[PDB]
Structure formats: C-alpha cells, structure tokens
Amino acid sequence: QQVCPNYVMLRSSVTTKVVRNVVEYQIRTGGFFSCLAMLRPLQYAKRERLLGQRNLERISTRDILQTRDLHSLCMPTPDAPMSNHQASTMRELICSYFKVDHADGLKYIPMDERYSPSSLARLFTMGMAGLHITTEPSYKRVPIMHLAADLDCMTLALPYMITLDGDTVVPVAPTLSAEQLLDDGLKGLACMDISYGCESSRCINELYCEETAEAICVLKTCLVLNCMQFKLEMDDLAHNAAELDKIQMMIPFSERVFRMASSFATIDAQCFRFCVMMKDKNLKIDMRETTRLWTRSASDDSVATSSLSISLDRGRWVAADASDARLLVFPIRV
Amino acid sequence: GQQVCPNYVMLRSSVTTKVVRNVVEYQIRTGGFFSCLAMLRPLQYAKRERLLGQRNLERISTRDILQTRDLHSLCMPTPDAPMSNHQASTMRELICSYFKVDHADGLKYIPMDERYSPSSLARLFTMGMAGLHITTEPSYKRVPIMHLAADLDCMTLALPYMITLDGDTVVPVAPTLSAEQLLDDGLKGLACMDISYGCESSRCINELYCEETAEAICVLKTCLVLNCMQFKLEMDDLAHNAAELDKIQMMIPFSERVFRMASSFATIDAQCFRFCVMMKDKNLKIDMRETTRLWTRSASDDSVATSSLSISLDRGRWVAADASDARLLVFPIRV
Ligand SMILES: C[C@H](CCC(=O)NCC(=O)O)[C@H]1CC[C@H]2[C@@H]3[C@H](O)C[C@@H]4C[C@H](O)CC[C@]4(C)[C@H]3C[C@H](O)[C@]12C
Ligand SMILES: C[C@H](CCC(=O)NCC(=O)O)[C@H]1CC[C@H]2[C@@H]3[C@H](O)C[C@@H]4C[C@H](O)CC[C@]4(C)[C@H]3C[C@H](O)[C@]12C
Ligand SMILES: C[C@H](CCC(=O)NCC(=O)O)[C@H]1CC[C@H]2[C@@H]3[C@H](O)C[C@@H]4C[C@H](O)CC[C@]4(C)[C@H]3C[C@H](O)[C@]12C
Ligand SMILES: C[C@H](CCC(=O)NCC(=O)O)[C@H]1CC[C@H]2[C@@H]3[C@H](O)C[C@@H]4C[C@H](O)CC[C@]4(C)[C@H]3C[C@H](O)[C@]12C
C-alpha cells in the first residue's frame, strides 16, 4: 500500500502482514531516509554518479511528470507543498555556488518564488558531491567539496543549536523555527552545529576553515531545507483526509513520524514541542490524533519549554527537567 | 606477533603461530600489501587519514628513528628498503605537473640519485586524487578531488588486465612486457591497460574516459604499476635476505599469500604472470624458500611457455588457460 505518494519526505510503503493471527505493520519511508542521507553528500550521490546523464533524459521526456520525477530534476513540484521563505536569497545562492547566471536560475525558483525545499536541498547536496543538475536534464561536473569527502567516513549525525556559557559552547534549546535560519543572509546558521560520529566524535564547526567555510553553510542549509519540506508535508497531511484516513488506526506509524520529527527537534521549535508531547503520551497515539499534536505544536504556548535544561551526552541530545527525562533525541543514520 | 619484513612496505607482515589440539596453525597478516592495493580506491585509501590534522605528520617527521614505515607516510625515499630508477626523470615532472609544484622541491620526492620508493610515489599520487597533497614539509595541502576517485568509491572489486584489438573489438591480451615498461614512452603504454571495477555494476575504467577524467585515469593506472614495481623490488630483495626468509622458510601457508599477492599484478606484469603460473603447476604446496627460486626463474622468458596461452575474461575473473586445463585463475582485488 502506498502512503503519501505525491510527497518527498512522507512517501511511504506499508505492508500489512498476518502471522499466527497477529497483525504486524511494517512501514517503509524511503523518501525520508533518502533526504536525510543528504547529510553525507558523497554517499547521497555515490550510486547516481555512475548511472550517467541518460538517467535525467528519460525522466524529463515522460509526460506524466509526477513529483518523484520532478524531485529527481531538482525542480518545483506541483501537487506537493512548496515554500516562499527567502526565495530571493535562495536563487542567488544557486547562482553563487554554481556560478550560473540569473536568467535560468529562475528555472529552479520561478517568478512565483515557490520552491520545493528538499528539491533545493538535493540540488545543493549533489553539487557538493561534484555533480550539478542543470536546467537542461544533464549532469555537469563541478568541484567536489573537500568537506563532503571528510564526512563520508561518518555514520551518525546529530544537529543541534549552540550558545555561549562564558568561553564555552553549550547546547541551547530551539527557540526559532528552521525557516527563520534562512534569512539575515543565512547568518543564523552560525549558531547551528552537526556532531558527526563513526559509531571519534567530530563537530562540523570544529572542521571550520576558509577553504571549507562555504561547504559548511550549504550542508547546514540542506538540513534546514529538508526540515522545511517536512513541516510542509506534516502541515498538508493534516488537511488531507484522502491519505490520513488510510493510516488512521495504524499506531505503529506514530513512532515513525516521531522518529522523523525527532531529526529536526534540535533545530526547529515546532518539532521540539511536537516530539515533547508525544513522549508525554508514551508514543501510543493513532495517526489522526498525532497530527492535532503537530497542529498545536505550532503555538509557543503548547508546551512549557523554558524550564527545560538540555545537555549533550554520548552523541544523544537530552532535553529533561530536573524531575525526569522529557525527550531523548538520537543521531540519524547516515 | 612475529614480525616479517619490517623494513618493507608491500611485504610488511605479522605472523602468529598457534597450536590447537597439538596441531600448529599459522595466521598470517599482510597489512602493507592490502594497504597499498587499497590505493585502487583513492577516497577509501584516505578516508580515515583525512580526519587527522597536519600535526600527525609533524610527530612522525620529528622522530630521529626515521624508519621505513615513517618514511612511507611522508612519501619520501626510503633507505633500508628497495628503490628504483626507472623513468625517474619523467616521474618527477609528473609530480610537478599534477601538483603544479616547481622543480627545486620536486627533487625532494625524487632526488639527484633518481632513486624513489614506488609505493611512496603511489601514496603521493593516490592522496592527491583524494584531494590531499603531501608536501615536502610535513603538511597536508588541499588539492582538487578527482571526480573519478568519487566515481569509483562505490566499487568493492577491481581487476586490472591488458587489452588489445580483435578487429574493432577489445579483447584481453596476456602480459608480455613488464609493468615497469609501462611507465616509459611518456606513459603511453598505459592505454593498453584496463581495470574492470565491480560491486560484487561492472565498469571498465576506460569506459569512463573523458577529457575531464583523463588525467585521473592515468594516475590511477600508474599507482597500480608503481605498487607492482614495489612488489618486484621486495620480492627480488627477499630472495637474497636470509635474515627474514629463514624465519618463515617452512611456512607453507605463506605461499598462498605470496601467490595471492603476485596474482594481483599477474595480469599486467609478464614476470608476475610466469611466477603465478609456476606455483599453480606445483599445486601451491611449496615451502617459502623454494617459492623465491621460482620467483627468480620467472624473470626469464624461457622459464614457462606462455605463447600458447589464450586468455579470457569470465564473470569478473581473469582466466588464462589453453588446451583442456586452467593454468592460472586470477581473482579481482578487494577494494
Ligand atoms: C555562540 C556565539 C554567539 C553568542 C551566543 O551564545 N548567542 C546565541 C544566540 O544567537 O542567541 C557565536 C557568535 C560568533 C560565532 C563564531 C563566528 O561566527 C565565527 C565562526 C563561524 C562558523 O560558522 C562557526 C564557528 C565560528 C567560530 C562561530 C561559533 C559561534 O557560532 C559563535 C562564537
Ligand atoms: C558563508 C559562505 C562562505 C563564506 C566564505 O567564503 N568564507 C568566509 C570566511 O571564512 O571568513 C558564503 C559563500 C557565498 C555566500 C552567499 C552568496 O554570496 C549569495 C548571497 C549573498 C548575500 O549577501 C547573503 C546571502 C548569500 C546566499 C550568501 C550567504 C553566505 O554568506 C555564503 C553562502
Ligand atoms: C587497443 C587499441 C589499439 C589496437 C591494439 O591492440 N594495439 C596495441 C598496440 O599498440 O600494440 C587502442 C587504440 C585506441 C585506444 C583508445 C584511445 O587511445 C582513447 C582512449 C585512451 C585511454 O588512455 C584509454 C581508453 C581509450 C578509449 C583507448 C582504448 C584502447 O587503448 C584503444 C582502443
Ligand atoms: C594523459 C594525461 C591527461 C591528458 C588530458 O588532459 N587529456 C587529453 C585528452 O583527453 O585528449 C596527461 C596530463 C599531464 C601529462 C603529463 C605531464 O604533461 C608531464 C609529462 C609530460 C611528458 O611530455 C609526458 C609525460 C608526462 C608525465 C605527462 C603524461 C600524460 O600525458 C599526462 C599525465
């Protein structure tokens, strides 16, 4: 069974199975783990770089042109949620990294100023791996970022926000939203850090350098973009009876959505409050009830996060009150 | 464990004899060999070293001990280990061309002696393809990462071999020249070599040829040729090295390893071809001391008759066989 087929992150494939008169739900969320694998760019493109330029040509000529086809082309996706945040600065960021001009930079972000954040993230991630998806359906070779080769030995990644405790960098809880990091000239990304690991621990800002500075910022942006794509599909799924009613009584799907939102719970305030609530209800909530938690999570009043002191322990992001642990975030695979 | 050839790169080994049920069992480790062939996948060769900062090199350089293992890490000429003089002139100007570095300190890789360590050279060029330039001073400098090195980093198996034309059709041909004789004539003899990479998906390295990737193809082939030369140089020296050979003289398990090692270059080097052929004839049950007598005959065209041997490529394996018998089976190299 297909769940959310016209969606980049929420595209799923569930398989109901009856064994010994006990039902078992096995969920597959390939689009999500495909988009998070952008955190290791060389691995994201390691198989596609050998398919050849032919790959793109076949997708473009097909008349159906579904969202999965348009995502592979790093193009705006009709029939799927899109955004407008800092589209002006997003387009000139394409033109800066790829050294391409304005006229056909509009072909990624049109005059509508609407783009698919994950389709944008795919474009920039492939560029860091050395492949530039062009306006025409072609692969063009661009310089491979050193940072992308540095990080390709890592298997675990943990983004989080930081602040100063007096000459010491300490984790701070997400107060802004991920979208609000794309403005002010992307200068809000300096307060984000991804801790890569091999399970040895290496923070991405520890590797900061004049040579690697550009690669650091793009990689952070792609994570922010994948977070926006996630919010946009989570927001749209709520107002989508067609798909939500299909998974309405699949409680196993709540752990997956929680697992997914957990990825951004350290950098997005809405995903922070959303995951907190579901840990309170012990993650045993039917899908339809889950999205009311997603919809309340949009209000600063929904959970009391001010009294929550967070600490970083053994590659896990702990958010906990003195009484008990409220939320454990685990590093995302690849 | 017990150390074998500790002042060598490709042949550095560590053996541990263990007696179980009053039966002795030998466990052999040849780290230097599999470290040098891992250069066939450059990004993987440097995937762990790129995280260590330049301070690493300084710690090894400041040491006055200056052993061969230390000097290999510095991509420097190695005293106390065999070195070569073949096309040293063109090897140095190839350093200066790829790294855009000048002549004066290009001599510091290949001195006025014109002696160099082929594996130290292979390490220098392999690290460059992974984006890191080992400098004359102990420092890591960032150089453009070769696209080809990223292309090949999904592959797990590699099989070098020599090629020829069958009338508009590329066919495998047996090694008639030595690997060294592929570094001369401006390195134009490498156009007859091909490496079939695979994921066991099969991709020949010349299928990926392009103006953008042309340099990367040639450097990767050269490093394989260089690692083969390093192997010959240590194999030649081991024969006249009683100190080490007598320690492992009766270790028949060591014969499979040397055969497994020489098999890697048996497809592009004529000497390694005849050497591996011989040991397959004696069913690979040869004591180490006798093995290196076979290695010494292998240097002569007359030792085995290879002219009647038609070679073919079967499911990613290099078959050399005629009549009704498989004379040599070469398997793809891991990583
Ligand atoms: C954490 C502090 C700011 C003080 C603070 O805690 N405010 C949080 C807040 O903005 O609310 C910031 C400001 C200057 C930053 C550095 C500079 O921008 C330079 C450089 C930029 C790099 O993107 C990440 C490393 C770092 C050293 C940055 C680390 C860190 O990002 C710093 C040292
Ligand atoms: C932070 C990185 C890298 C900076 C650098 O080269 N190192 C400086 C250092 O190490 O001191 C830069 C590279 C190109 C920049 C972008 C481009 O110039 C285009 C555009 C320019 C605007 O003034 C600010 C937004 C932004 C998207 C820029 C954001 C950000 O400013 C980028 C993505
Ligand atoms: C095998 C044939 C030559 C016929 C032959 O067998 N003569 C051997 C001989 O020279 O004695 C050569 C000539 C043209 C070569 C190609 C061109 O030089 C272009 C290009 C050059 C690259 O170095 C390796 C790949 C290849 C496609 C080459 C593959 C292969 O190297 C070819 C197709
Ligand atoms: C074959 C490759 C790549 C050629 C290329 O850019 N593509 C051409 C194409 O695709 O037609 C070149 C790049 C630099 C060359 C070397 C440098 O020029 C230095 C030096 C120059 C000598 O004339 C011949 C030996 C060699 C080592 C050269 C061997 C070989 O000639 C190299 C290693």
Half-sphere exposure of B69 (CA within 13 A, CB side): 11
Asked if residue B36 and residue B137 are part of one domain, the reply reads yes
What is the full DSSP assignment across A61-94?
A: H-SS--HHHHHHTT---TTS--B-TTHHHHHHHH
Cβ pair B316, B198 in contact under 8 A: yes
* Residue A152 near chain B (CB below 8 Å): yes
How far is residue B239's CA from residue A196's CA, in Å, rounded to a whole number? 48
Cβ pair A183, A173 in contact under 8 A: no
Show the domain range for B44. Answer: 32-143
Closest CA to B153 of B63, B76, B220: B220
How far is residue B171's CA from residue A152's CA, in Å, rounded to a whole number? 37
What is the full DSSP assignment across A179-206?
A: GGGSSGGGGGGGGEEEEEE----EETTT
Q: Cα separations (Å) of A110 from A90, A102, A106, A133?
A: 11, 11, 5, 16
Q: Which residues contact A103 (CB under 8 A, 6 or more apart)?
A: none
CA of B191 to the centre of ligand 3 (A): 5
Cβ pair B120, B35 in contact under 8 A: no
Helix (H, G, I), strand (E, B) or coil at B203: strand
Residue B279 within a domain: yes
Q: Scanning every residue of chain B, which has its alpha carbon at the shortest distance from the alpha carbon of A44? A: B154
Going by the DSSP 8-state scheme, the letter that residue A154 receives in this structure is -
Q: What is the 3-state secondary structure (H, E, C) of B83-115?
A: CECCCHHHHHHHHHHHCCCCCCCHHHCCCCCCC
Q: Scanning every residue of chain A, which has its alpha carbon at the shortest distance from the alpha carbon of B130? A: A149
Asked if residue B273 and residue B300 are part of one domain, the reply reads yes
Closest CA to A235 of A291, A300, A160: A291
Structure-block tokens of residue A145: 């970022």
Contact residues, chain B, for A146 at CB < 8 Å: 131, 142, 145
Contact residues, chain A, for B130 at CB < 8 Å: 149
Half-sphere exposure of A188 (CA within 13 A, CB side): 15
Cβ pair B204, B192 in contact under 8 A: no
Residue B129 within a domain: yes
Going by the DSSP 8-state scheme, the letter that residue A324 receives in this structure is S
Give the ligand at the shortest distance from the Cα of B218: 4
CB atoms within 10 A of CB A279: 15
Residue A166 within a domain: no
How far is residue B194's CA from residue B160's CA, in Å, rounded to a whole number? 6
How was it solved?
A: X-ray
How far is residue B68's CA from residue A330's CA, in Å, rounded to a whole number? 44
Structure-block tokens of residue B273: 């071809």
Cβ pair B192, B198 in contact under 8 A: no
Backbone angles phi, psi at B38, to 5 degrees: -60, -10
Cβ pair B66, B95 in contact under 8 A: no
End-to-end CA distance of chain B: 25
CB atoms within 10 A of CB A46: 19
How far is residue A81's CA from residue A237's CA, in Å, rounded to a whole number? 10
Residue B23 within a domain: no
Helix (H, G, I), strand (E, B) or coil at A17: strand
How far is residue A32's CA from residue A226's CA, in Å, rounded to a whole number? 9
Structure-block tokens of residue A259: 């697992």
Backbone angles phi, psi at B78, to 5 degrees: -110, 100
E strand segments, B167-236: 170-173, 193-198, 203-204
Contact A42 B153 (CB under 8 A): yes
Residue B76 within a domain: yes
How far is residue A146's CA from residue A142's CA, in Å, rounded to a whole number? 12
- CA-atom Rg of chain A in angstroms: 20
Asked if residue B41 and residue B134 are part of one domain, the reply reads yes
How far is residue B245's CA from residue B261's CA, in Å, rounded to a whole number? 17
Cβ pair B4, B238 in contact under 8 A: no
Interface test with A, best of B45, B48, B49, B50 (most A CBs within 10 A): B50
* Residue A150 near chain B (CB below 8 Å): yes
Axis-axis angle for helices B253-265, B270-281 (nearest 10): 150
How far is residue B229's CA from residue B78's CA, in Å, rounded to a whole number? 14
Contact A49 B130 (CB under 8 A): no
Residue B36 within a domain: yes
CA of B173 to the centre of ligand 3 (A): 13
Q: Which residues contact A242 (CB under 8 A, 6 or more apart)?
A: none
Q: Cα separations (Å) of B167 from B164, B170, B171, B191, B326?
A: 9, 8, 9, 17, 26
Residue A287 within a domain: no
Contact residues, chain A, for B142 at CB < 8 Å: 146, 211
CA of A191 to the centre of ligand 1 (A): 5
* Residue B50 near chain A (CB below 8 Å): yes
Closest CA to B153 of A37, A152, A196: A152
Distance of CA B329 to the CA centre of its chain: 19
End-to-end CA distance of chain A: 26
Number of structural domains chain A divides into: 1
Cα angle B149, A55, A93 (rounded to 5 degrees) comes to 70
Atom of ligand 2 nearest to the CA of A186: 29
Domain boundary among B221, B255, B272: B221
CA of A312 to the centre of ligand 2 (A): 29
Cβ pair A2, A109 in contact under 8 A: no
* Residue B53 near chain A (CB below 8 Å): no
How far is residue A11's CA from residue B186's CA, in Å, rounded to a whole number? 54
In angstroms, the separation between the Cα of residue A124 and the nearest Cα of chain B is 17
Closest CA to B278 of B298, B300, B257, B263: B298
H or E stretch including B330? strand B325-330
Strand pairing class (A202-203; A192-197): antiparallel
Atom of ligand 1 nearest to the CA of A175: 11
Residue A294 within a domain: no
How far is residue A222's CA from residue A215's CA, in Å, rounded to a whole number? 11
Q: Scanning every residue of chain A, which has its alpha carbon at the shortest distance from the alpha carbon of B207? A: A50
Going by the DSSP 8-state scheme, the letter that residue B332 receives in this structure is P
In angstroms, the separation between the Cα of residue A213 and the nearest Cα of chain B is 14
Structure-block tokens of residue B269: 């080097």
How far is residue A72's CA from residue A52's CA, in Å, rounded to a whole number? 13
Asked if residue B284 and residue B318 are part of one domain, the reply reads yes
How far is residue A129's CA from residue A149's CA, in Å, rounded to a whole number? 8
